[PDB]
């Protein structure tokens, strides 16, 4: 293994980032599960020949009790690791019917190299469930561990109403976070829901600011 | 004359003449 070890390590780091992403989004993942050592990862998801068997790592996550108390309508979550380098339309159809039959309220999909453009016009075509697509690349590093990136907390409905009443605001007037920047993708943010940012201002230490996703 | 010191800015009928 000259570069196959590098592929295995990148895939393990991507898996760790996905577990951290789900946990931050508010699902039940054990700390030992998140901080999975490389040897245990190889002994679990990798065969003797060294190939990264990516069918095993497709896991199902459920909200925690605190997450259920915060957001009443949070459902289960599904994560997939497609074996083929490019995800095809047939695989996308299988994924969407799988999400429908399991009645998951949220599905997470990854693609090793590329996704065909034709398999992208029908993902937002099955409400109310949503499908979010990430890559094995751009996930080898968790972009919320960067000191420039503050801590983002997804504001609940009650807290958002309290914020709007406190500032006598309108949902449009708040500072805006794009739907496609890495933090909103990381949190799985939806249009209309406010996020909370704890900024490390050098003049006031901790500082609480809120952005809305529009 | 007719400054804003002798005549009202607007005279509006509140209701019908009663």
């Amino acid at each position: 293994d000259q570069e196959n070890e590098r592929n295995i390590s990148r895939l393990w780091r991507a898996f760790r980032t996905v577990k951290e992403m789900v946990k931050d989004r508010g699902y039940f993942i054990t700390q030992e599960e998140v901080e999975l050592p490389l040897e245990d990862f190889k002994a679990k998801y990798c065969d003797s020949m060294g190939r990264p068997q990516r069918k095993m790592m497709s896991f199902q996550a459920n909200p925690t009790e605190e997450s259920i108390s915060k957001f009443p309508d949070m459902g289960s979550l599904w994560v997939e690791f497609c074996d083929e380098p490019s995800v095809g339309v047939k695989t996308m159809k299988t994924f969407v019917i799988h999400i429908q039959e399991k009645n998951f309220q949220t599905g997470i999909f990854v693609y090793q190299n590329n996704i065909t453009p034709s398999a992208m016009k029908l993902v937002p075509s099955i409400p109310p469930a949503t499908i979010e697509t990430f890559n094995e690349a751009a996930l080898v590093v968790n972009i919320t561990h960067h000191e420039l990136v503050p801590k983002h907390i997804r504001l609940s409905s009650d807290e958002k109403r309290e914020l709007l009443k406190r500032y006598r605001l309108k949902e449009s007037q708040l500072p805006r976070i794009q739907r496609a920047d890495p933090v909103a993708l990381y949190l799985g943010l939806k249009r209309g829901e406010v996020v909370k940012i704890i900024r490390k201002s050098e003049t006031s230490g901790r500082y609480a600011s809120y952005r809305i996703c529009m | 004359t007719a400054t804003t010191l002798n005549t009202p800015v607007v005279i509006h009928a509140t209701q019908l003449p009663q």
Binding site: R168, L169, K170 | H12, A13, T14, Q15, L16
Partner: protein, 101 residues
């Protein structure tokens, strides 16, 4: 006509009442800001220079701004600051209600 104006006036006054914030829940600064002090002095000076009745005793001074400053020192300025919230809501603080510096 008259009824159209009546409903227009009712809508206007209803909006005004819906925007006003009662005295028991205003969350603005108890102090009088420098801008509020300066404008209250200027407006009171305008009023007194326009032959308004005065409350404090004149010490021979004739500068209207100085007389207004004397009134502010004696808290005899009969004016109200209507602090406007960004959305149009307003809190009616009184000059005597506010603490100058």
């Amino acid at each position: 006509g008259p009824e159209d104006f009546q409903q227009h006036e009712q809508i206007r006054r209803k909006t005004l009442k819906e925007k006003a914030i009662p005295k028991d829940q205003r969350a603005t600064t108890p102090y009088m800001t420098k801008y509020e002090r300066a404008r209250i002095l200027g407006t009171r000076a305008l009023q007194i220079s326009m032959n308004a009745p005065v409350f404090v005793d004149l010490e021979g001074e004739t500068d209207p701004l100085r007389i207004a400053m004397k009134e502010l020192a004696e808290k005899k300025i009969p004016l109200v600051i209507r602090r406007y919230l960004p959305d149009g809501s307003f809190e009616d603080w009184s000059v005597e209600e506010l603490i100058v510096d």
